[PDB]
């Protein structure tokens, strides 16, 4: 009766950051120990809570968010951060309590001539609210002339593709990111630790 953290971290394919996937983990026993034991982790940043004490806590719900971004952009997955990824693709609340877990995945998400399948939102007229998912592919209107669904002057495609190539530097290589958000409300707990 263990929680399916394997389906989130050992997933064969990851989502793009604009269409980041969320798994609702509830009514299970969360080991949390398969994490903080694997050495294939570039960053493991926990805010407000400690993963060591996670095995002794109960939560009503646990959220796991999966996507792929560049190494330069992993810095922006943190409370009070700004940038293209933080403002238009994935935003954490300034009082975020949880963990952001990222590791290099150049072996899996890089193709010989470039993967070009992982996308990110380049244009947006306002910043995303925390935990918001904008999967719109509508042509971005940068002027006053209607775009009518075509791309051209003052009408750009809102999404940009990553040039994930194995010969890229460490910054440009793809990093799979999992964000663990812990929820607690005035409801009975459903996700407890091993004890």
């Amino acid at each position, epitope marked *: 009766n263990l929680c399916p953290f394997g389906e989130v971290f050992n997933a064969t394919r990851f989502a793009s950051v604009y269409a980041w996937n969320r798994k609702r983990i509830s009514n299970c026993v969360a080991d949390y120990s398969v994490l903080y034991n694997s050495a294939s982790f570039s960053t493991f940043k926990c805010y407000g809570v400690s993963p060591t004490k996670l095995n002794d806590l109960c939560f009503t719900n646990v959220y796991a968010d999966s996507f792929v971004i560049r190494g330069d952009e992993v810095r922006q997955i943190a409370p009070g951060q700004t940038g293209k990824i933080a403002d238009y693709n994935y935003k954490l609340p300034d009082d975020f309590t949880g963990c952001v877990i990222a590791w290099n995945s150049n072996n899996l998400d890089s193709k010989v001539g470039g993967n070009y399948n992982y996308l990110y939102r*380049l244009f947006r007229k306002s*910043n995303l609210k925390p935990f918001e998912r904008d999967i719109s592919t509508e042509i971005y209107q*940068a002027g006053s002339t209607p775009c009518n669904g075509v791309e051209g*002057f*003052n009408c*750009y495609f809102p999404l940009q593709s990553y040039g994930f190539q194995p*010969t890229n*530097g460490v910054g*440009y290589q793809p990093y799979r990111v999992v964000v663990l958000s812990f929820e607690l409300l005035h409801a009975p707990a459903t996700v407890c630790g091993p004890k």
Partner: antibody
Amino acid sequence: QVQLVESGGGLIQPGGSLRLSCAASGFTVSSNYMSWVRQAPGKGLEWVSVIYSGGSTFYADSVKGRFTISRDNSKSTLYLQMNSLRVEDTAVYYCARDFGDFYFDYWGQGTLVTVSS
Amino acid sequence: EIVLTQSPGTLSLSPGERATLSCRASQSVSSYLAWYQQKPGQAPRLLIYGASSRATGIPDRFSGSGSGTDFTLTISRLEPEDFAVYYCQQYGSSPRTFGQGTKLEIKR
């Protein structure tokens, strides 16, 4: 058609304040990335600041804490408030439309700012 | 943080020839490079973006080439209006940086 008309440049004493303006035509400023790029006389180009379509701002280290970039949707104008100016800041300042914080497709005519006593 | 070096600093060619301008980066930028043209007394004009894609309204004689750390801008069939200072700009890592420029002169 895109037009960028700049104003506000001139001679200002060191440590003084000066605000540059950039009237924009052919696009909505609130929905585009915009940047200020300066070029010292006889020298190359230097990026100063950028404002995102979502309102986010970024500045170069050589001007951070002294320059503030702002926009006015009702007037369709881009502004750069240059406080605590230094002699090294004397350059022609360009107002350019930014394509996703990558490159500058359209440029203004440029205004000369001279910071001397 | 990342420096762009343009070679040659100055170049002199007769009209109708072919100009090859080089831009070398201190780090790999993965085709995140742009080219600009600045005539004397005027603002830069965007020529190339993405290190290969030509900007709108730019004549076919301009072509972008290169990836990684070395780049090349080639101008074919040099017309008298294609002689100015050319800069390369990278956007692979903040802050965005420009080159020192390559002056293109006319031989006579």
